[PDB]
Amino acid sequence: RRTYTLADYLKNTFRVKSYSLRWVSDSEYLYKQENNILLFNAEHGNSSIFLENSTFEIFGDSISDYSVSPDRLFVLLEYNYVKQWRHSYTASYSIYDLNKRQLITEEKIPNNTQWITWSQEGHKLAYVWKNDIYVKIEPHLPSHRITSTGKENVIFNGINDWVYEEEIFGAYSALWWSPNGTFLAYAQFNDTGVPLIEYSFYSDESLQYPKTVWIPYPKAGAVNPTVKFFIVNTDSLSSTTTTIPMQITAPASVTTGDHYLCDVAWVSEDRISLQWLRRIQNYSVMAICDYDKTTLVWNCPTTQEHIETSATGWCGRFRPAEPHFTSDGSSFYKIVSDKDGYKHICQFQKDRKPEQVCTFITKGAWEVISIEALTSDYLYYISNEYKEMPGGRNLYKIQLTDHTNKKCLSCDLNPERCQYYSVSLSKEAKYYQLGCRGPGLPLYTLHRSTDQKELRVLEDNSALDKMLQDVQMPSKKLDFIVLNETRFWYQMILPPHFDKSKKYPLLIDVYAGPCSQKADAAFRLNWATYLASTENIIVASFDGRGSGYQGDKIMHAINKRLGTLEVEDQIEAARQFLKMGFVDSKRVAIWGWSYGGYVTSMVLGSGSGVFKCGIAVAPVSRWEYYDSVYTERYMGLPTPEDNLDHYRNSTVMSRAENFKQVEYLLIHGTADDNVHFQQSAQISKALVDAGVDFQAMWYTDEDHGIASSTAHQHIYSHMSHFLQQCFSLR
Amino acid sequence: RRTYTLADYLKNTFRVKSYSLRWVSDSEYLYKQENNILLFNAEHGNSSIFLENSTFEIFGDSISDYSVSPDRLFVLLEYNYVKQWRHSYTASYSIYDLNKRQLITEEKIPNNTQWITWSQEGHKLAYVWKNDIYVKIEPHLPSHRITSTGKENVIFNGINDWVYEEEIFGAYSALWWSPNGTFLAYAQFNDTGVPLIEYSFYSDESLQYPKTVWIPYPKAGAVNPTVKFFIVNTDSLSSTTTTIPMQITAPASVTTGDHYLCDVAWVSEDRISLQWLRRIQNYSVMAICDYDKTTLVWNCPTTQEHIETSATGWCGRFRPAEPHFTSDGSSFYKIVSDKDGYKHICQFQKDRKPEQVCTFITKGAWEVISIEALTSDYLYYISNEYKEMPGGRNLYKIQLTDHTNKKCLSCDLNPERCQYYSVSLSKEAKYYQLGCRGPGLPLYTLHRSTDQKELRVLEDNSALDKMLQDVQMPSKKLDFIVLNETRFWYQMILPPHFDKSKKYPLLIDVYAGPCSQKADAAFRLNWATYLASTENIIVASFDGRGSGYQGDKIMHAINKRLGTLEVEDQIEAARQFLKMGFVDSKRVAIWGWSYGGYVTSMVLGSGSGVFKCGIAVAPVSRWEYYDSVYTERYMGLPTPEDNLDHYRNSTVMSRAENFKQVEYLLIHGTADDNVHFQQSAQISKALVDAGVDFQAMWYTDEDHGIASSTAHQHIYSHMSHFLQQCFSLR
């Protein structure tokens, strides 16, 4: 009869387990068990020790992570990890010789590395340090400098600058070892003309004068960083002092004005696939380039250009989808919007074809989330086709030769507990692990590709199950409402003994940004749980216009004009929830983080009178303040020649007046490098000039995540009390 | 039956008048009446128009201020005023020819001047621009550049750098015209090695990238700016292209290590008086320097050195008092602590005397606040001797020849309404205006020095009086309590129909910094009024140890150890107030600004359990973060060789834990150049790491005063609501 305390959430009392493995071959994988790396044989439980409780404790308690070379002859030991942005970070490393049974101590690697990675085959290493690329053909051998143009916050070799790291590649890495590890391709960014943002850092109270941090950051419409792509022949290194990398120049239909490097993908060792994007992501080109043995140069013939375009809005969900090539690299499959606006799979030939470059393998009013594997005869993927639940995730597979032999591999399994699946296939797809994140407690099982015989159960959260028994967990409803004749899904977290006759306070959780999805069938133990289990508050989210994986008609609905429909629909959703009955019209709130904090703010400021209070954490207050890549992708350029007007008609501070009818809570990280603070400072200011009172809270030296332990606990406790005050509880 | 609304306060509904005149001669003065400058004859009401409703409206609504040359032949028109720090600011100027009846338009003065001032006689002007000194012997004539070493945030010629402006001279000016206007003395500051503080400014929401503001600011113990003093002969200018200023080097007993320039004072035209201070204000020297006609050099003979010292703490209230010389400049009177620690007046001879340099003219257990005038036979001053009320201010006068002939000139007048006087005597003291700020509504009267016959009443706030009739104004009690056998004054603002039988909530208003005084007999219409008149809250202040003008024993009580006794005593004061009866022990708060915000914080963090909640606005959180001049004056240097230990044992964040027993409100200006914000950011941080919840509020782009209109209204409304929540009202 115990409720789910805020402490339960904050102190993470009820642990949710998982099985994160690392396929080492087509039939064996690695697993961390009690700080011991084990090798499992998919087929039989056959296990074995790969690395002991030991080895790790030499560098003691600072072993951040490990990386096993693909020949399993060496292991990378990361330690002295230090964050820097979402994915960037610097560590120190040591190579462990599995055979010689000891730590390699000769040609060590720089005690401040920015990035490192094995090749795809041998024990070849490529790392970035002081912004330059270095290579080591063998763990024992000396380093070979590849670039020397590297310079802090100016020239990036093999790693992304701030914006690319966040908005394009999703990671720090800008390296790509070719198969058979001959070449090593990398990108190089010049931030030279990109403006700087400078926020203060305070550090220990012992620091008398506070430091200052600058970052080349391009806000909407400002000068963007430039790019160049190179491929260097790794095999020569031993016979020279310097090697001259060969450069690939982007395709002409892109080199006329600003543009970007979407994605890099090696096809075969003499073929590589690069995707480019215009600054206005209205257009994109994916060139295929071949290596010329004779002239030792890479060619990217317009004949193999391949163009992707969008008259509705922009390309891809957040960028063109990655291509998947066949062994002989003759054809490739890629996810693109079909004639009806539904992201599906279709075949392409290396060469382009006049208005026929595709042939879809998938049709329907649902979308393919991601291609997972390409066999000689099969294509494994993941879609939300099942039960017409766009909020669901299932693993399908199609026989290449017969586009009819399309069978779902996870639909059946456990329909009661699982509707949201994660996958992971062995090197050549002989086995495949399943990640049930589905409605019920996550269930990790492993199967044999051949006939789908579930070999065994890797992890059933039985333990967690046994613990939640003695606790009043709330429920989660996942349905859809319908407006202007269209399904719009939503999800509600209903408190324990939910009684449809009573009235409960409502809280909307928001994101609502382009291609966002808050209404899905995944299991989660978060703040909303405490809010429902113990405060008896209903937490709901609603995926409205401009969103999810329900087709472009819906997603692009927002194109060129954010702060419009996605906001309104968030309001209607509350209207609808009230019409459902069980909601106390006089106690409805709304909060959001990032984009959500925006909408939250934009909603509280609409004067709809539907909401009583809200909370915005590190919200964007006006699109000019946000980074270019993201912003422009939907908003265009903030210029009278383009879309300036819409940038201006969607300012949070312009709706200041209307904030008198609301209790508002604004929160922001003092060291937010993503959503600058300027954003909130600009908001507060506005409200103050309007004579509107509100509540604020800043978090000294916190990221855009306010994720430090102490701060994490602090901010939620605070928001809780804010809701308590607002809802007349506490 | 109307109470005094917060609006009444914020919108300044009940206007308090005053009479600010400008003595032009020993018998006439200037007064602004309905935007018309009038000339009044002290003796008869005889008036006359000096400048019309007109003239001012040419430059329209931007005429910031005016300055009339001493020959009354020209008038300075200041416009395009732009603030910059407490006193610094830049304007544009135009000279008006009273005789020719028009604006001089020939050799205009720089459209961005930093400072300007007439001589003491003619129409000579000296101004600073781009950090250099320029002179114009006549409004119509061309400018004569005096210095060329000037450079932004590096070399200051004729104006003070940040710290000197705030902590030493109290103004931007660093110019001094000699009498008979021959020489022009100025100071020059080199900030070269002074560290920088850089805070961000956000400006209009249209500014995409927020600006950054840097300032050479010396925090405790850091490298201080250096000084040099010069005197240039103004009479030569016309006969050269460049003139070479002569420099005075400070006295040897100061040039061994860091030191300061206390004060500058011209005696006669061939004599000037400079006061120097050691970085450790334990010691100070006041040299008298004479001009050598023959060698064209200034001498500052050790024979006329004059040393001031303090074994108890530091020199002066905030710096050595200014000397007052006789016509023949043979002797001078200056305020210094006597044998008992009471700031009094004593005579000095130009030459020093072995342990006898003084002869006090004033004895007693009270202090002379300030010397106001020195006649051929009289010395007018102002002390808090009357009724033994250290919180009172009265105008006394002593006959030089007879140190017995000491008569008070304002004591009698209106003992019921006035106990706090302001003065202003005509050039040679033939008349004198009185400023009654006393207990009742301010009363401005003018008298004839000769026999003190009150000529007439300049301003009686009759109007304001008539308006407050229809309003329930609160009362103000000014008494003293006694601890360890010593009088310690305090003041309480009692709500309307105050009934000693009931119980009221208590709010302590704080400063409590060295030589501070909150308990005085002055009339004021502030926030505390609304708090009492409408919220029925008692607002009280208590001048405890280390403070006021009650002698050094009390003031120096804090020396070398701030955050000690002044804090404790602030607590005892609340204890005592409770023992008085009429205070609701379960509803006692405390708030403060600046130093007060410190104590407030230090109090809430003492775990005395006496206070329920509090508010700290832009508080200092630890002395290392504050400027050198102020801090070191009481704390010394933050080094193990000196007083580091006490710097560390008085951190607000070190008392974080104890904040769980309190509702706390922290507020801070985003552009605070005085108390950096780092100070609060460091506090918040601390509390967050302690797991303590509190309430915060930042004011985007506000000074250390959060004095913009919109922000001013905003912050008080907010604090009000904070008290309402805390006191269970609203």
Ligand SMILES: Cn1c(=O)c2c(nc(N3CCC[C@@H](N)C3)n2Cc2ccccc2C#N)n(C)c1=O
């Ligand atoms: C409550 N309260 C004060 O604390 C206060 C004050 N005047 C001063 N000063 C005298 C002139 C030089 C100036 N640097 C200091 N302080 C002290 C202070 C401490 C720390 C930071 C800023 C400040 C300021 N300004 N007043 C008027 C007042 O009400």
